[PDB]
Write a protein that holds these residues in place. Structure first.
Motif, PDB file in Angstrom:
ATOM      1  N   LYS A 390    -101.770  49.282   5.846  1.00 61.32           N
ATOM      2  CA  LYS A 390    -100.694  49.857   5.057  1.00 61.32           C
ATOM      3  C   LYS A 390    -100.987  49.570   3.597  1.00 61.32           C
ATOM      4  O   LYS A 390    -101.247  48.421   3.233  1.00 61.32           O
ATOM      5  N   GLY A 392     -99.607  50.371  -0.415  1.00 60.83           N
ATOM      6  CA  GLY A 392     -98.546  50.851  -1.273  1.00 60.83           C
ATOM      7  C   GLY A 392     -99.102  51.221  -2.631  1.00 60.83           C
ATOM      8  O   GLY A 392    -100.045  50.603  -3.116  1.00 60.83           O
ATOM      9  N   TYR A 435     -98.016  54.538   1.338  1.00 61.08           N
ATOM     10  CA  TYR A 435     -96.654  54.630   0.842  1.00 61.08           C
ATOM     11  C   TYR A 435     -96.703  54.746  -0.670  1.00 61.08           C
ATOM     12  O   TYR A 435     -97.308  53.904  -1.337  1.00 61.08           O
ATOM     13  N   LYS A 461     -96.304  58.858   2.867  1.00 62.91           N
ATOM     14  CA  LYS A 461     -94.863  58.696   2.766  1.00 62.91           C
ATOM     15  C   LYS A 461     -94.472  58.600   1.301  1.00 62.91           C
ATOM     16  O   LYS A 461     -95.027  57.791   0.558  1.00 62.91           O
ATOM     17  N   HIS A 480     -94.386  42.106   0.234  1.00 63.08           N
ATOM     18  CA  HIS A 480     -93.097  42.714   0.534  1.00 63.08           C
ATOM     19  C   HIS A 480     -92.613  43.440  -0.706  1.00 63.08           C
ATOM     20  O   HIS A 480     -92.303  42.811  -1.718  1.00 63.08           O
ATOM     21  N   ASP A 485     -84.683  53.352  -1.620  1.00 65.33           N
ATOM     22  CA  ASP A 485     -84.964  54.756  -1.359  1.00 65.33           C
ATOM     23  C   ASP A 485     -83.779  55.540  -1.891  1.00 65.33           C
ATOM     24  O   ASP A 485     -82.743  55.641  -1.238  1.00 65.33           O
ATOM     25  N   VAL A 492     -84.865  49.176   0.632  1.00 66.53           N
ATOM     26  CA  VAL A 492     -85.992  49.151   1.552  1.00 66.53           C
ATOM     27  C   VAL A 492     -86.767  47.858   1.344  1.00 66.53           C
ATOM     28  O   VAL A 492     -86.695  47.228   0.291  1.00 66.53           O
ATOM     29  N   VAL A 494     -90.656  47.303   2.382  1.00 66.51           N
ATOM     30  CA  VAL A 494     -91.884  47.795   2.988  1.00 66.51           C
ATOM     31  C   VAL A 494     -92.940  46.714   2.846  1.00 66.51           C
ATOM     32  O   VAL A 494     -93.260  46.295   1.731  1.00 66.51           O
ATOM     33  N   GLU A 495     -93.485  46.262   3.964  1.00 71.45           N
ATOM     34  CA  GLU A 495     -94.510  45.230   3.967  1.00 71.45           C
ATOM     35  C   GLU A 495     -95.882  45.881   4.094  1.00 71.45           C
ATOM     36  O   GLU A 495     -96.189  46.493   5.120  1.00 71.45           O
ATOM     37  N   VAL A 496     -96.707  45.735   3.060  1.00 72.78           N
ATOM     38  CA  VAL A 496     -98.010  46.378   3.004  1.00 72.78           C
ATOM     39  C   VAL A 496     -99.094  45.312   2.972  1.00 72.78           C
ATOM     40  O   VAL A 496     -98.857  44.157   2.624  1.00 72.78           O
TER      41      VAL A 496
END
Ligand SMILES: Cc1cc2nc3c(=O)[nH]c(=O)nc-3n(C[C@H](O)[C@H](O)[C@H](O)COP(=O)(O)OP(=O)(O)OC[C@H]3O[C@@H](n4cnc5c(N)ncnc54)[C@H](O)[C@@H]3O)c2cc1C
Ligand SMILES: Cc1cc2nc3c(=O)[nH]c(=O)nc-3n(C[C@H](O)[C@H](O)[C@H](O)COP(=O)(O)OP(=O)(O)OC[C@H]3O[C@@H](n4cnc5c(N)ncnc54)[C@H](O)[C@@H]3O)c2cc1C
Ligand code: SF4
Ligand code: SF4
Ligand code: SF4
Ligand code: SF4
Ligand code: SF4
Ligand code: SF4
Ligand code: SF4
Ligand code: SF4
Ligand code: SF4
Ligand code: SF4
Ligand code: SF4
Ligand code: SF4
Lengths: 662, 662
Positions: A390, A392, A435, A461, A480, A485, A492, A494-496
């Protein structure tokens, strides 16, 4: 003297603020005025015809036009005055539109009329004392200089050379290419950057009309549109090209780029081309595709162990005692193409750029994803070398930011390159998800919207929210990302595995020093300023200097190349003619009034003044080519021994006297 | 023949897909091969040195390089072959990277090796039969043509003329200026458009090196880089310039732009410059600032009443019986600058453009807000002439739309001009509010983000939602705009007095016809296509034709001018040299094999073939300048009497035979 006064209405822009009839009658009753007359559009062909007919009929000595600004329409009415049998410089304007009408529109009419009468009186008083000037023509040296060896510098150099002008290409670094040489693939066509640019690098390296001077800086510049005496610093490269080796007497040659020197060098230092991710010896090339394949020596880090010279052997290309050589070059025009650097994003502490291992920026990501980079083209996590799944992308990182830390402008290409990087990860790592934390996707150029559509189709995304802060997991080193959003309406987390910051761009290091050497000003944004923001985005206010590339403001490679060729054309205009006319505003010393005190000499920024011998008396001498017409010296000289050609003391004092006349 | 085979690794891009050692040994055992050898980067200076040393040592007749694509590196290796004592055209490549490695990477290695051996064999077979060609040099006529008199056309014409090349400026309309002449103010600096452009219009009109031909079209173009025989249609203007009047014998002159003709004309028709909002007579000028102030007659609407000629009187400028004159002009290069028109937004029925009175588009709004427009610069409602107090701006109107009605691309400037119009209404009507229904504000250029900040500060409301549909109130004629405020999260119903659609732009009317006359292709988007989307945004694939302005894709006036000067520079490159080299791919007729059937003559699109007399026999004659090397004729001729210079039948058949050799 006989003066004609022609008052424009500007199509009710002036007649709707004052009484043009009253201004005209006052002009008729003014002293020295032969004819006063009016017309709706004095800048139009019937208006010039009116001026010319009046000149011929009334034998006019000078012309005063009560109209818009001189900065708008001096050339028009000077040419209209020439066509008619006068000198262009027997003409003077009275700005009664942008400084009378548009500022005294409402509820004050006779006051604006009185102001117009005053301005017309002052203009007539000056024009009754103007006399003939002829512009100075100066020869133009048939060479050109291009500072910067990026795509914009290389394009400008190739354009000038293929137009036939001999060109100097100055690059501070040991190789040409610039940032596009660091790019891996290019939006929106996804071509390999080196593959599309290597051809043009070869053209530059082989062109007989281009004097490619890499690893060289510009110490000082003096001169003007005609001759620029530019002094260059040839930094001690430490290694000799074959030509220089043969000149120094080594028949066997200089550097052939074999690599034995760097194979034996024991010093290891970071590579600035690879943004520091990769080692390079003290003697080195950035990458294997550098245009002059000549292997600079880094003298700040060399320990003079002498292994490199033994490895080089009979080629004898390495001279460890080389020093900075200085060269002075005379050029006609100059093109500035200094490019850009990434804004320091470690100042934005909420995104842990320097403090978290797996947070990188977009040029480091581009080097990590390139197949010629420190990795084998495999994107791996800096913290442990594992493949991310993942990723970002923090868009607008330090941009459109009014807090004083980041930049208040858009960097133009960061939305597009983030889309490119998302595509690259989703196609190179199977099952990886991209993301993009975005705040206005800006895909404005040709095929850009289609590129955006294609990236969304492949499955990136898009979360519309500016990242608030980033926390690092203590054990997995995962990041993190916290934002909202905004379209979904929820926070949100989102852990990348990898976070990429699309940082803002800023003018390169030393660019302000170079543009002050050349006399160029800066914009509000901090980039170099252009002559007219709409109709002249290449030229600067200082004549003979032109801008090309990101140095004037951020842009994509297509826009940069268009700007570079435009600048090359503008720099070729005076070289092809060979003449160029200077504005006759120079200082002229009246010798039988000069007393030789020499005090004015230090008041000239351009060193146009000096003390010389004329008829035994020591008087001041003006280099009329070097003078720029500022007037500092002539406003100083107590004895009135300096005359300013179109703004003489009698003229200015006549204007003052006419203002106070009632 | 003696052939050398040099196999590049491309730095593991090829060695990671095949066995380079095996390919090299196979090349050694091939027939005609003198030397086979390998290197890591054959496109680098050691690689060219390797080629040259091999040529000198082994007395090579030809060189085969098993490397990347010919479209990428023919010039490099042809120049490397020249430097070494060979002809450039004794060289042939074998594409074993982009057509072997990158497509047979995974899990198939000996198969890729066999494919590489086959490609090397076919390349060697062709190169053993190549022989010497010398490129054709053709003279270049020292004139240039610029089609389009907008800002991009005027800038290109001025640039070429000031470089010294005589230039033709063709404009279909009676005046130069383009859309920028219709603009009222300009973002992001708020300057008056006509005020900044009129100086440049005057320069174009006065330049001795520019042949300004307004109200003229391009009927047909034939020729090539050397000489373009361009036929122009001089449409019947109906009125004579002073020069033409004196030529025809009228001493008193032609048209001086007095206006008596249009003062007496009884026909009244819409003005296309004012987008139809304003009347104009049958004899007319668009606006008072047109550059040729010559008063066209509209012959589709003139009733030949003859009042205009009586009004003109002794000037005798009006010739009501004038007809379309045709002129043929020979030019060296051509610059295309056709601009753009607004996409027809009446097709989007949900926004009642044609059906509701108070819905307008952005060029009609710009004419309504200009002080020289149909109103006195006062924005009033079309339905009743009252001043609006709420104005809506529908951004993206017909853009970024994949439904097949609108355009799938961004028009680039519509976010910026909508911000300008919001500012203009909020400053011109006190207390009026601007609502912008937006979906990605795109302020990417220099000072654009600051302009956006300033507009929000002055108090425009930004509602992030694409307008769904528009309903008209039956009585007040007010417009109910329905969308969702996506950030607020609620539907909205904003009732405005005036709705402005920021419509998409599309290529001008007739632009496809003109670009087919000149041989230019189109993009996916429908705009004219450039030679290389990154590194050559001005030139086209057809030599001697260059693009400038919005005709290549939407852009702001700064980008348009940069592109125009870039195109002028590219068009000047071959004119200044005076020579240009054509690629020696021409057809050559073998006369003692030609039978004179004449059947090939009609297979040439360029009419390069004809039947002529040589030695009594009627044989075919190739105009080697007109030939382009396609090969249609030589693929037709049954007797083999046409030879294609670098792709001869023996060469191609040798390639086929070598493929089937085992
Ligand atoms: C991560 C990233 C990805 C990008 N991706 C793309 C993409 O896919 N497609 C695209 O079109 N654009 C892309 N861009 C933008 C692109 O890099 C620029 O448009 C382009 O490089 C501009 O080139 P330039 O010549 O003006 O500047 P530069 O490439 O920076 O070149 C300037 C040159 O001048 C030299 N120099 C600087 N100061 C001096 C001095 N005082 N004296 C002498 N020499 C000096 C520098 O060393 C350098 O060689 C990307 C940008 C970034 C940051
Ligand atoms: C409402 C609106 C507002 C805008 N506001 C701004 C602004 O504030 N600032 C800004 O920078 N930009 C603005 N723009 C964009 C700006 O108008 C363009 O950047 C610019 O006009 C491009 O000029 P051009 O010469 O390429 O095309 P054009 O101006 O369209 O000129 C093309 C010319 O070629 C002629 N022509 C066409 N076909 C032929 C043919 N076959 N033969 C001969 N002649 C032909 C046309 O008659 C025309 O004279 C705006 C655009 C719109 C629609
Ligand atoms: S000269 Fe100036 S004031 Fe007069 S019509 Fe022209 S622009 Fe308007
Ligand atoms: S060993 Fe000598 S010739 Fe070889 S790369 Fe190093 S400096 Fe150049
Ligand atoms: S002198 Fe020693 S440290 Fe310096 S480049 Fe040569 S081997 Fe490296
Ligand atoms: S280009 Fe995109 S990512 Fe870069 S500053 Fe502008 S909006 Fe942000
Ligand atoms: S011009 Fe004036 S200031 Fe200059 S040397 Fe002469 S007297 Fe002194
Ligand atoms: S006006 Fe005087 S001080 Fe100014 S540049 Fe000319 S000589 Fe120097
Ligand atoms: S010639 Fe082609 S394959 Fe060989 S190194 Fe260069 S780019 Fe790679
Ligand atoms: S009356 Fe004659 S001279 Fe006057 S504008 Fe009309 S055509 Fe031109
Ligand atoms: S002939 Fe009659 S209709 Fe035609 S332009 Fe003249 S006055 Fe108008
Ligand atoms: S420029 Fe703005 S308004 Fe125009 S299509 Fe693009 S996003 Fe929509
Ligand atoms: S070249 Fe062939 S096709 Fe052409 S005229 Fe001769 S025989 Fe006929
Ligand atoms: S190859 Fe033959 S058909 Fe094609 S352009 Fe040349 S002469 Fe005409």
């Amino acid at each position: 003297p006989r003066i004609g006064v022609f008052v424009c209405h500007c199509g009710t822009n002036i007649a709707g603020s004052m009484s043009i009839d009253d201004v005209v009658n006052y002009a008729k009753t003014l002293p020295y005025v032969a004819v006063a007359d009016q017309y709706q559009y004095m800048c139009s062909t019937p208006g010039q015809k009116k001026i010319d007919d009046a000149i011929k009929e009334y034998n006019l000595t000078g012309v005063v036009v009560a109209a818009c600004s001189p900065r708008l329409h001096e050339p028009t009415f000077r040419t209209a005055t020439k066509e008619g049998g006068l000198n262009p410089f027997r003409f003077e304007m009275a700005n009664i539109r942008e400084q009378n009408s548009w500022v005294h529109m409402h509820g004050m009419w006779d006051e604006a009329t009185q102001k117009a009468k005053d301005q017309v009186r002052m203009a007539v008083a000056k024009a009754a004392k103007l006399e003939d000037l002829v512009p100075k023509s100066v020869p133009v040296e048939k060479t050109a200089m291009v500072v910067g060896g990026g795509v914009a510098g290389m394009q400008a150099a190739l354009d000038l050379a293929s137009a036939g002008i001999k060109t100097y290409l100055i690059e501070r670094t040991p190789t040409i290419g610039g940032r596009m040489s660091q790019l891996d693939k290019t939006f929106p066509t996804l071509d390999c950057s080196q593959c599309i640019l290597t051809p043009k690098m070869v053209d530059v390296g082989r062109h007989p009309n281009i004097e490619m001077m890499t690893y060289t800086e510009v110490e000082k510049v003096e001169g003007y549109i005609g001759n620029f005496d530019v002094t260059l610093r040839k930094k001690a490269r430490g290694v000799l090209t074959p030509t220089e080796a043969t000149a120094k007497g080594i028949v066997g040659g200089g550097c052939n780029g074999c690599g034995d020197c760097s194979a034996v060098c024991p010093v290891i230092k970071p590579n600035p081309f690879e943004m520091g991710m990769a080692p390079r010896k003290a003697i080195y090339i950035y990458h294997a595709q550098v245009m002059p394949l000549i292997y600079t020596v880094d003298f700040d880090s060399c320990v003079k162990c002498g292994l490199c010279v033994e490895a080089c052997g009979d080629k004898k290309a390495i001279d460890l005692e080389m020093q900075d050589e200085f060269i002075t070059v005379k050029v006609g025009t100059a093109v500035l193409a200094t490019g850009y650097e990434l804004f320091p994003i470690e100042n934005k502490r909420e995104w842990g750029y320097k403090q978290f291992d797996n947070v990188i920026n977009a040029l480091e990501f581009e080097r990590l994803i390139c197949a010629s980079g420190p990795t084998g083209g495999h994107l791996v996590r800096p913290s442990d070398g594992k493949t991310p799944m993942k990723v970002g992308f923090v868009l607008c990182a330090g941009s459109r930011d009014n807090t004083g830390i980041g930049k208040p402008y858009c960097s133009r290409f960061c939305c597009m390159y983030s889309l490119k990087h998302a595509h690259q990860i989703m196609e190179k790592i199977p099952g990886a998800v991209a993301y993009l934390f975005y705040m206005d996707i800006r895909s404005f150029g040709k095929m850009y919207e289609e590129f955006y559509y294609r990236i969304q189709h492949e499955g990136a995304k898009f979360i519309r929210g500016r990242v608030a802060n980033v926390l690092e997991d203590k054990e997995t080193k995962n990041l993190h990302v916290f934002t909202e959003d905004t379209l979904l309406g929820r926070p949100v987390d989102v852990e990348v595995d990898l976070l990429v910051l699309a940082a803002a761009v800023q003018p390169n290091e030393g660019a302000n020093e170079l543009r002050k050497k050349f006399g160029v000003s800066a914009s509000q944004d901090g980039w170099m300023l252009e002559a007219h923001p709409k109709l002249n985005p290449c030229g600067t206010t200082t004549a003979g200097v032109f801008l090309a590339g990101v140095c004037q403001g951020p842009k994509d490679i297509p826009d940069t190349v268009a700007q570079a060729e435009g600048a090359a054309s503008a720099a070729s205009i005076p070289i092809h003619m060979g003449e160029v006319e200077l504005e006759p505003y120079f200082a002229m010393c009246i010798d039988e009034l000069c007393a030789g005190c020499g005090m004015c000499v230090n008041l000239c920024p351009y060193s146009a003044l000096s003390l010389g011998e004329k008829n035994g008396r020591t008087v001041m001498v003006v280099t009329e080519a070097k003078c720029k017409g500022c007037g500092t010296c002539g406003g100083f000289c107590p004895g009135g021994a300096i005359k300013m050609q179109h703004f003489t003391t009698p003229q200015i004092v006549a204007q003052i006297d006419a203002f106070f006349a009632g």
